Amino acid sequence: MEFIKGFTFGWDSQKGYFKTERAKESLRLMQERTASEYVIVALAALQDTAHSTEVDFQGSHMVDDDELIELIDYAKSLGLKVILKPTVNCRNGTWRAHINFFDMDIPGEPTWDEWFESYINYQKHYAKIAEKTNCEMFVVGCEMVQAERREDKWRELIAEVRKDYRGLVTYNTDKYQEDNVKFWDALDVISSSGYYPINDWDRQLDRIEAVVKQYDKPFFFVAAGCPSRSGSALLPNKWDLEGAINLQEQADYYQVMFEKTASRSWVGGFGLWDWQTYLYDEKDATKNDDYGVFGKPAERVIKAYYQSR
Ligand SMILES: OC[C@H]1O[C@@H](O[C@H]2[C@H](O)[C@H](O)[C@H](O[C@H]3[C@H](O)[C@H](O)[C@H](O[C@H]4[C@H](O)[C@H](O)[C@H](O)O[C@@H]4CO)O[C@@H]3CO)O[C@@H]2CO)[C@@H](O)[C@@H](O)[C@@H]1O
């Protein structure tokens, strides 16, 4: 598989965002300033809590099918390939990694089968969209740490997705969880949220290597990145981390990350975390403490490295 030079887009979007021309502008800025050849459209449905069974993708937190199809078409019209990544959030704030139900089915309690039924139906709806728009890859799940043990249900879900979509299929595991998934044989690509510390890449890359070699498959970090924020380089996943603005720390993180993964041939690309739909003004970049890379010194590290591959 070719080296995926990718960037995540659209995580901030809601109903209506993908029609506006600000969205089309942001996408062109993203491609121009980073040299990304892939866009990872990251969307999120909602369930009430980590222990609810209804997954809701029709409410206004979610873009409508028509503006999504349009945004994808527009992306491909710019020479960008498209990975579609529908995951799920909780309305009470709980990280999806905690979505969980009892092992046994208990009378009157929510069950794994009820959740997976709602979640399968959600995935199939977007797998049909991925097929009609000829997306290159489709991500059936993201950081579902406590659900990953339910292997037969993930295998059932992947089969259901293949009925609608004939392209590449992967699953996005969380950091340090690459061997927590036992259904990699059923996917085409292995991927993880590579939020590893700036000073621990060697140990982590060596662990992941041995996990990948147990399987048939290419690997890439479908998510990776770092806020421009003091302390983030050691904990790049923690989006609510409290620390002063620090653009240089974000640039150091990307420099180190590309340097360490460039020597590893099984590391097959990136879906850098994120490029916002409603991008800030480049004048305010110097005071932005978010994952965004627009107008910041890390923007040039990514452009150069992606342009070197
Ligand atoms: O309700 C009120 C006010 O809030 C607005 O929304 C929130 C929302 O409540 C929630 O906090 C949401 O969280 C984010 C977070 O900002 C990060 O982007 C985070 O990211 C991670 C992602 O989940 C994956 O782990 C990925 O791999 O790594 C990312 C970085 O770690 O994603 C969280 C959601 O899962 O942020 C928004 C806005 O900040 C709106 O509801 C608005 O309506 C209302 O006025």
Side-chain angles (χ1 to χ4, degrees), residues 11 14 85 88-89 93 95-96 142-143 172 174 193 195 223 236-239 273-274 290-291:
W11 183 243
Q14 286 156 304
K85 172 184 173 164
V88 60
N89 285 333
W95 185 24
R96 66 195 77 90
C142 168
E143 297 157 8
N172 185 173
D174 191 42
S193 278
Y195 288 120
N237 63 294
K238 205 29 147 184
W239 48 270
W273 198 265
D274 51 345
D290 221 296
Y291 288 92

Side-chain angles (χ1 to χ4, degrees), residues 2-3 8 61 93 96-97 148 184 189 200 287:
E2 68 176 356
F3 191 75
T8 305
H61 55 272
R96 66 195 77 90
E148 284 163 355
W184 289 122
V189 180
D200 199 25
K287 202 188 216 218

Side-chain angles (χ1 to χ4, degrees), residues 82-84 124 126-139 158-170 188:
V82 182
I83 306 177
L84 188 56
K124 284 166 76 42
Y126 286 93
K128 289 182 175 66
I129 297 176
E131 177 70 12
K132 152 202 325 190
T133 62
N134 296 129
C135 285
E136 281 66 16
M137 193 176 320
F138 187 88
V139 181
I158 290 154
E160 280 293 11
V161 163
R162 312 259 198 202
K163 278 163 80 183
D164 296 318
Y165 171 76
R166 292 95 208 184
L168 292 184
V169 176
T170 182
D188 308 314

Side-chain angles (χ1 to χ4, degrees), residues 132-297:
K132 152 202 325 190
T133 62
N134 296 129
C135 285
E136 281 66 16
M137 193 176 320
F138 187 88
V139 181
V140 295
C142 168
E143 297 157 8
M144 306 290 298
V145 178
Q146 296 289 46
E148 284 163 355
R149 76 192 188 265
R150 301 303 288 212
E151 181 191 322
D152 292 339
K153 306 300 300 184
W154 284 106
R155 295 173 174 289
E156 177 183 335
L157 184 149
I158 290 154
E160 280 293 11
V161 163
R162 312 259 198 202
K163 278 163 80 183
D164 296 318
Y165 171 76
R166 292 95 208 184
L168 292 184
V169 176
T170 182
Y171 168 86
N172 185 173
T173 202
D174 191 42
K175 62 210 181 287
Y176 306 98
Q177 302 301 152
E178 284 94 350
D179 204 31
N180 199 50
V181 169
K182 309 303 181 194
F183 51 82
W184 289 122
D185 41 278
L187 302 154
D188 308 314
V189 180
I190 308 183
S191 67
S192 76
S193 278
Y195 288 120
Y196 292 110
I198 196 160
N199 67 337
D200 199 25
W201 275 110
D202 289 316
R203 183 166 63 128
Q204 289 323 311
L205 290 166
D206 292 351
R207 173 182 59 74
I208 300 171
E209 168 164 319
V211 179
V212 164
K213 295 313 121 189
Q214 321 176 2
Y215 298 102
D216 222 336
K217 324 283 191 174
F219 174 94
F220 78 127
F221 295 116
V222 63
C226 192
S228 48
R229 189 181 311 171
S230 306
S232 276
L234 289 179
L235 283 314
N237 63 294
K238 205 29 147 184
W239 48 270
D240 55 19
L241 181 152
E242 204 284 307
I245 311 167
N246 195 330
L247 269 41
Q248 189 60 38
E249 188 145 318
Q250 174 187 66
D252 299 335
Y253 186 94
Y254 275 98
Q255 185 275 335
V256 170
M257 165 165 81
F258 295 144
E259 197 266 337
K260 296 280 180 177
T261 60
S263 91
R264 259 96 164 182
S265 84
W266 55 267
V267 169
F270 295 90
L272 298 173
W273 198 265
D274 51 345
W275 196 282
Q276 284 189 322
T277 312
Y278 289 2
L279 201 56
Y280 46 77
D281 289 86
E282 200 163 357
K283 135 178 115 166
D284 291 337
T286 54
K287 202 188 216 218
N288 183 281
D289 70 339
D290 221 296
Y291 288 92
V293 86
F294 179 55
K296 298 181 176 160

